[PDB]
Ligand binder design. Structure first.
Ligand SMILES: CC(C)CCC[C@@H](C)[C@H]1CC[C@H]2[C@@H]3CC=C4C[C@@H](OC(=O)CCC(=O)O)CC[C@]4(C)[C@H]3CC[C@]12C
Ligand SMILES: CC(C)CCC[C@@H](C)[C@H]1CC[C@H]2[C@@H]3CC=C4C[C@@H](OC(=O)CCC(=O)O)CC[C@]4(C)[C@H]3CC[C@]12C
Ligand SMILES: CC(C)CCC[C@@H](C)[C@H]1CC[C@H]2[C@@H]3CC=C4C[C@@H](OC(=O)CCC(=O)O)CC[C@]4(C)[C@H]3CC[C@]12C
Ligand SMILES: CC(C)CCC[C@@H](C)[C@H]1CC[C@H]2[C@@H]3CC=C4C[C@@H](OC(=O)CCC(=O)O)CC[C@]4(C)[C@H]3CC[C@]12C
Ligand SMILES: CC(C)CCC[C@@H](C)[C@H]1CC[C@H]2[C@@H]3CC=C4C[C@@H](OC(=O)CCC(=O)O)CC[C@]4(C)[C@H]3CC[C@]12C
Ligand SMILES: CC(C)CCC[C@@H](C)[C@H]1CC[C@H]2[C@@H]3CC=C4C[C@@H](OC(=O)CCC(=O)O)CC[C@]4(C)[C@H]3CC[C@]12C
Ligand SMILES: CC(C)CCC[C@@H](C)[C@H]1CC[C@H]2[C@@H]3CC=C4C[C@@H](OC(=O)CCC(=O)O)CC[C@]4(C)[C@H]3CC[C@]12C
Ligand code: NA
Lengths: 20, 181, 169, 98, 132
């Protein structure tokens, strides 16, 4: 469960940081 | 670059910029940086006489392959190793070693990147913000790994399995997460 | 006018780190784009070589000697609990040697050194080695009360490959 | 900053401060510090002649983000794991590591 | 048209500082290098000591490569000694892993060959004073 949760949060974090 | 005189002023000398751009004639290529344009302008303030100025702007691009090939690849490497301590089973005894080691490598690259950067507070670079995000994430990974390692070593002689973990973590979620015993 | 044809190395105090091969001197008559007239100049060209013993005993032999440990993980049995410690240690030691080599060399982005390329290569493959060894530790500690064993793994990972790898149970 | 003249003294030259503050008409902001006040004052000792002095005070404030992102977040981060070694079981031998 | 006058300061060094601060931890970690073989393989601590000794030797090699001048004319005896001991510790690591693998062999995975039956149970235990 925490594997899926932290994977989703980490993917959204990389997208939201490297958007520009 | 701001060229002007300290003795005389605009009421006593002019200062005429000849060409719009600084010339690039005896230029040796730097190897690290790239000159892309070199404009130059002449600044005078209306309603403020005795002011002369000739400024030249150097807008400089970086050849980025060195810091890319030495810092961006280990950054994404040690970030890729951070969502990986959860696939490791708790029956082995090598979870906390991996978690502490990933947090150590991330703090090491943060202290390395805070050295080549200037110490200003205009804005942090995206590498420092990215490592701060991933470092807080690895610390939450450590505390949830200790929490998920406590529930592995619970014996029937010392604990009683409550009915809510029976109805939640045994029936609904193994069908929600495609586990199926 | 040049007097000789090379720089004088008659009173040359030895260095002990760099050895001079040759140092010629050449006269040119060049014309700049500022100015409409010809200016002469004399260019000397030292051609030196590093004597490579301080770095091959302190930066190449330990680097190669720890990069020959990234393949030694896979002969260690999973019943012990040291599959990770070895991988983590060699990864962090290669990271420290990468810090040392980016301390020593300049930041010229024209070409990359062979030693820095070798360090990046070995770091990539040792990271792929730890993401393999966590998978084989998950495969090892696995019981029939938690997982069902598939049908295609009975033929591939148990009958097709040990006849090739010379294991034979 | 204490300005004074080595050659002369108060019995020979006075030293009058013209404006109470220092001028910021050519100041470029450093991006690392913040000036907040630059007062100047004249110092003279009664019962001790031949003493002029002009002292400028620079009152500066540090822009607190660069050391917060580097020496406060790991400081408040590795502190949270100190009382976390007690919730770990004593059966899996990984307490001494943490 | 060539005269000069040369003075030759020949100086001996008082060695008591670097003897206490560098030679004693050097021979200390070298004494710990040959020590991982008396440890039993049943406890899971055969790798930690080996890797720790190798990292401490690389630390002292990078420490001694700083107070020395960077001349390739000759290398000191300490640098050659630490290079020798580091090669010895790496060979200790590969033979420690290779002797840790033959500890966890079971009849459900491997099968004992007759040559390792007859060699490592009769000749060498009577040669190395083991006597079962
Ligand atoms: C992409 C490469 C570099 C590995 C990076 C680690 C993770 C992105 C991978 C490795 C193991 C994978 C898991 C392997 C097994 C499964 C079971 C499968 O059912 C669901 C996906 C999942 C959790 C995978 C999710 C993605 C994981 C964690
Ligand atoms: C909300 C922020 C500020 C802290 C986040 C901490 C959580 C990542 C940890 C702390 C307490 C943990 C819980 C403690 C007890 C258990 C019981 C256990 O059974 C299931 C996991 C769970 C809910 C843990 C889930 C993860 C939690 C919420
Ligand atoms: C190339 C020289 C410098 C040695 C470098 C170390 C490794 C590349 C060698 C030394 C010991 C070798 C191992 C010795 C024993 C065997 C058993 C053999 O069966 C399979 C290969 C393997 C693991 C060897 C794999 C390659 C190893 C680790
Ligand atoms: C680091 C970047 C440049 C390349 C990443 C490569 C991975 C996406 C691939 C290459 C080898 C793959 C592994 C090869 C073998 C296995 C065993 C296989 O069974 C399960 C997938 C897995 C772990 C693979 C996971 C994904 C891996 C690591
Ligand atoms: C982030 C740190 C500062 C606080 C959270 C740490 C938790 C992992 C631990 C510390 C105290 C533990 C609690 C202490 C008391 C109990 C009562 C006990 O009954 C059930 C577990 C629980 C809630 C523990 C759940 C997990 C907790 C919150
Ligand atoms: C170098 C000193 C300061 C540390 C001593 C560590 C080893 C050198 C000692 C510890 C155990 C000793 C062994 C103890 C048992 C025996 C059995 C005996 O029969 C032969 C000597 C031997 C191998 C001894 C050889 C020397 C050993 C390995
Ligand atoms: C790093 C290189 C240069 C030296 C490593 C030496 C190994 C290649 C050799 C030396 C002794 C050999 C071992 C001697 C005894 C046996 C027992 C035998 O049963 C299985 C092979 C094995 C472990 C041999 C495997 C390979 C070993 C470790
Ligand atoms: Na350890």
């Amino acid at each position: 469960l925490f594997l899926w949760v932290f994977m989703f949060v980490c993917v959204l974090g990389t997208v939201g940081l490297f958007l520009p | 670059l701001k060229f002007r005189s300290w003795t005389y002023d605009h009421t006593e000398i002019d200062m005429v910029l000849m060409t719009p751009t600084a010339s690039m004639d005896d230029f040796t290529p730097s190897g690290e940086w790239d000159i892309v344009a070199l404009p130059g302008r002449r600044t005078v303030n209306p309603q403020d006489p005795s002011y002369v100025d000739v400024t030249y702007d150097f807008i400089i691009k970086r050849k980025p392959l060195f810091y890319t090939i030495n810092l961006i690849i280990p950054c994404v490497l040690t970030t890729l190793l951070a969502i990986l301590v959860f696939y490791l089973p708790s029956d082995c005894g090598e979870k906390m070693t991996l978690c502490i080691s990933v947090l150590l490598a991330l703090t090491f690259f943060l202290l390395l990147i805070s050295k080549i950067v200037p110490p200003t507070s205009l804005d942090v670079p995206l590498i420092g913000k990215y490592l701060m995000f991933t470092m807080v994430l690895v610390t939450f990974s450590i505390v949830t790994s200790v929490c998920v390692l406590n529930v592995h070593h619970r014996s029937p002689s010392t604990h009683t399995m409550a009915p809510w973990v029976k109805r939640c973590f045994l029936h609904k979620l193994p069908t929600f997460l495609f586990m199926k015993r | 006018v040049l007097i000789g044809s090379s720089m004088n190395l008659k009173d040359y105090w030895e260095s002990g780190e760099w050895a001079i091969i040759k140092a010629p001197g050449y006269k040119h008559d060049i014309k700049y784009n500022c100015c409409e007239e010809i200016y002469p100049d004399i260019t000397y060209s030292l051609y030196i070589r590093r004597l490579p013993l301080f770095y091959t005993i302190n930066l190449i032999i330990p680097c190669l000697l720890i990069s020959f440990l990234t393949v030694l993980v896979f002969y260690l049995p999973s019943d012990c609990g040291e599959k990770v410690t070895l991988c983590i240690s060699v990864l962090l030691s290669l990271t420290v040697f990468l810090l040392v080599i980016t301390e020593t060399i300049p930041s010229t982005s024209l070409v990359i050194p062979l030693i820095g390329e070798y360090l990046l290569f070995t770091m990539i493959f040792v990271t792929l080695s730890i993401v393999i060894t966590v998978f084989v530790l998950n495969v090892h500690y696995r019981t029939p009360t938690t997982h069902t064993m598939p049908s295609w793994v009975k033929t591939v990972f148990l009958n097709l490959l040990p006849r090739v790898m010379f294991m034979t149970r």
